[PDB]
């Protein structure tokens, strides 16, 4: 949204690569888009499904946060757990997540309220928040 946020948001994303998404593009490049998403939130599931669209020019780092409340962190924190770095499983792992119907089973949120409050504290206020290259 904000240049002066997302250059605080992008030390976030560096600060915290162990538990950002890393989907290499189909087209080898350096640009990056940096992807900041709910799953509970429509338009981040809208902007999940055009993963592949976004992967045919760009490098994705998606950033999962618990904004809008019990369940979306429970599935950030399920996310968190079960991330493997194989992009095909992870994406799979995604999708699921991102289905409306879908509900995030009971986990510690521990990692997943650490990360949502960091990427909060660069001013951050709404999902999903993009930067691009």
């Given at each position: 949204e904000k240049l002066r946020i997302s250059a605080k948001l992008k030390e976030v994303f560096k600060a915290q690569k162990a538990n950002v998404f890393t989907f290499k593009a189909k087209k080898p490049s350096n640009k990056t888009i940096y992807i900041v998403s709910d799953f509970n939130c429509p338009y981040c599931q809208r902007e999940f499904a055009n993963l592949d669209k976004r992967l045919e020019s760009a490098n994705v780092e998606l950033l999962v946060v618990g904004f809008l409340g019990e369940d979306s962190i429970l599935k950030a924190a399920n996310a968190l757990k079960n991330k493997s770095g194989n992009q095909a499983k992870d994406i799979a792992m995604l999708q699921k997540l991102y289905t409306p119907k879908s509900k995030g089973q009971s986990m510690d949120i521990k990692a997943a309220m650490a990360l949502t409050q960091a990427v909060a504290d660069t001013?951050?206020?709404?999902?999903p928040y993009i930067i691009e290259p």
């Open positions: 001013g951050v206020r709404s999902v």
